[PDB]
Amino acid sequence: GSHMSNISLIVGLGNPGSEYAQTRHNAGFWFVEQLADKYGITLKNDPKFHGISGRGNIEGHDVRLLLPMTYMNRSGQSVVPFSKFYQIAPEAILIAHDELDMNPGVIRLKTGGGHGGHNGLRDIVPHIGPNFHRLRIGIGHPGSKERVSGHVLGKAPSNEQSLMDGAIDHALSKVKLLVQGQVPQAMNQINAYKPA
Template identity: 30%
Template structure:
């Protein structure tokens, strides 16, 4: 019987030090534990590092403890830890990250092979972990929209994503977005099941 499991890792800069839109993935993951009726987050060692984890029978939620731009090796090590416990054919990797191209709070599934569009966290993960080695494991990205400033020069965009998140932005990311992320996980599982059964 097909028993799918999901490793869901959020990318961002470590909280609470960096409470910015760039850490939208972490805020969404905070609320996702509740949306999926998961146990609360607790500190554990995974991928040889201490990190916040919510472990349930189907979903393992992990907040990457590293800076965004160097998250790849941590994600790869956690994936290796999980593959030792589960058959890779029944394990999916889901990366939750911020997305400038979408309005605040818009959630969508993004194909793994889609361009990172300058997102250094995604670039780092792809450099450290090759999906080709796990052809039966769905690797997917969940992009969480954070909107973008009117001007697109690098300095303005950088300030926008790294400034302290407002209370309202945080409410949207932690209380609204997680339910949409949970829905995307259901869609992902349905699609995966139909592929396995055909």
Template identity: 35%
Template sequence: MTTDASTGGTAGPWLVAGLGNPGPGHAGNRHNVGFLVTDLLASRLGGKFKVHKSRARVVEGRIGVPGVSGQRIVLAQPLSYMNLSGRPVGALRDFYKVPVGRIVVVHDELDIDFGALRLKKGGGDNGHNGLKSLTKTLGADYFRVRFGVGRPPGRMPVADYVLKDFSAVERKELDYFVDRAADAVESLIVDGLERAQSTYNS
């Protein structure tokens, strides 16, 4: 097992949870950007999501250079709705015996411009129901890859905004930003938080 730059340990796999709501009706929503990023990571691993008894879809694989910086990774997409994300992620944590310091959560962030990223460890939930559920189950000390979706226009309620699909203008750039977010997840795991922040925090 390789030593990880951000934890200084030789623990088991990393758990990367992309947040979203299940079902085709939500697939293009801003709230589902965590699913988009983990879908791309799964394709990079050459794996397909399978339903796990934890009520999540999972893919297992390795990223990095095998034997040098290779890290075992479990990608997860909860099958619960966003506000109950903590239950399946907590069950996966227990099943794979993952310490909180090796859990990465990818989620939408209202207070960041569309496509911008912020990587951090710990912190509050900023009113995000998925993070609220996760923190209740895991504690707050997990890594976050925060994908900016911007604020709703005018007086549109936040709930309506995040449950709408990305706009036609946003979709023109969405693939690029999702690709960059997937790169950021890989860098966080392989290179450590500080190096990933210096490259991807924008």
């Protein structure tokens, strides 16, 4: 099982399929895929947990990675049984996700709170509660309430993509702190990120 607030499960939220891979709602997938490549963690088919998952060493810690393949609004159907099976408490979970309420190039580490309208988080919090950590990857908000689906299922223009990519890269450099349980320092250093 997990141990205290040493992060040992990192989840990236998104939708399956090439048609969604470049969309804003897959920001969490981008982060976790890049993290897996950085540390040489194999992301392999995990049909039992309706996802793609991996396990490997990050800075001397045994960490699991998970990409639900359920579609976004059914993400809990992967995350919940996976975390329960491996006895990973929410306090040891980091979920990376797109955040409508923040600008592209803004990234923050948050502990607790609600789903903020995010349909992936909405499927997870009812089951494990809110006390997991979140890597909120800013994607911006569309023109109004009605445009949300068109925004999150859109491919960002190059400038916004560059801003997100830089923020994601910064966060990758701070995962060492997270797997070491240094959540306060990680929060300070992630939240301080500026693109320019």
